[PDB]
């Protein structure tokens, strides 16, 4: 069902695309959200995915936090994918702009290995403040399952491919 991707490795693929539009087209089994520990989906990929669900992702996430408390940096939880996917895997990469340890990025990507195939964004990139080239390197070196990476920014996509 995924089309137009560049193969980087045996199991990692990449495309210049909006992950929201990709999820609406493919209806993947799992879409990854670039979450924070409170599951407050205000901006970046999380704000865009939540708006595409008409805020249903945020209402579900608030009930999850009321029952379970916050996630760990490097951790994840599986919730509904609403109108975008069967499931959403909310994964917390470290936010460098909040002073979090970049070494937790490998632990964040290890959550992907629990799912045979995923549609995902680059973790800890964008407003999370990490170097996207480093994030793609950790993804390739950690994830063993089939990951389809959707990169929204065209200039970033071109830089990630040409420096890989
Ligand atoms: O350019 C990108 O691929 C990146 C992100 C992003 C942010 C917001 C957004 N809204 C719709 S698709 C999307 C992707 C976060 C990390 C890198």
Residue 73 resides in a domain? yes
CA 52 – CA 38 distance, rounded (Å): 19
Task: Kindly report the CATH number assigned to the domain that includes residue 73.
Answer: 3.40.220.10
CB of 143 shorter than 6 A to ligand 1: no
CB of 133 shorter than 6 A to ligand 1: no
CA 25 – CA 79 distance, rounded (Å): 20
CA 137 – CA 75 distance, rounded (Å): 19
Residue 77 vs residues 3, 5, 34: alpha-carbon distances, Å: 27, 27, 12
Dist. CA 18 → ligand 1 center (Å) = 7
Instruction: Please give the tally of structural domains in the chain.
Output: 1
- By residue range, what is the domain housing residue 17? 6-161
For 55, left (φ over 0), alpha (ψ -120 to 50), or beta? left
DSSP 8-state symbol, 61: H
| Closest atom of ligand 1 to CA, residue 124 | 16
| Other CB atoms within 10 A of residue 141 CB | 11
CA 61 – CA 80 distance, rounded (Å): 9
Dist. CA 11 → ligand 1 center (Å) = 21
Residue 100 resides in a domain? yes
- Nominal resolution in Å? 1.1
Dist. CA 136 → ligand 1 center (Å) = 14
Helices H, strands E: what count in the chain?
6, 7
Residue 1 resides in a domain? no
| Closest atom of ligand 1 to CA, residue 18 | 12
CB of 119 shorter than 6 A to ligand 1: no
Residue 23 resides in a domain? yes
Helix (H, G, I), strand (E, B) or coil at 54: coil
Q: Whose CA is nearest to atom 10 of ligand 1?
A: 45
């Amino acid at each position: 069902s995924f089309s137009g991707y560049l193969k980087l490795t045996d199991n990692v693929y990449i495309k210049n695309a909006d992950i929201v539009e990709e999820a609406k087209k493919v209806k993947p089994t799992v879409v990854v959200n670039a979450a924070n520990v409170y599951l407050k989906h205000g901006g970046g990929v999380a704000g865009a995915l939540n708006k595409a669900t008409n805020n249903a992702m945020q209402v579900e996430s608030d009930d999850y936090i009321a029952t379970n408390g916050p996630l760990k940096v490097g951790g994840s939880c599986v919730l509904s994918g609403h109108n975008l996917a069967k499931h959403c895997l909310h994964v917390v990469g470290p936010n460098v702009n909040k002073g979090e340890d970049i070494q937790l990025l490998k632990s964040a990507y290890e959550n992907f290995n629990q799912h045979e195939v995923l549609l995902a964004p680059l973790l800890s990139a964008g407003i999370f403040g990490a170097d996207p080239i480093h994030s793609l390197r950790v993804c390739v070196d950690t994830v063993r399952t089939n990951v389809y990476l959707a990169v929204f920014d065209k200039n970033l996509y071109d830089k990630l491919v040409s420096s890989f």
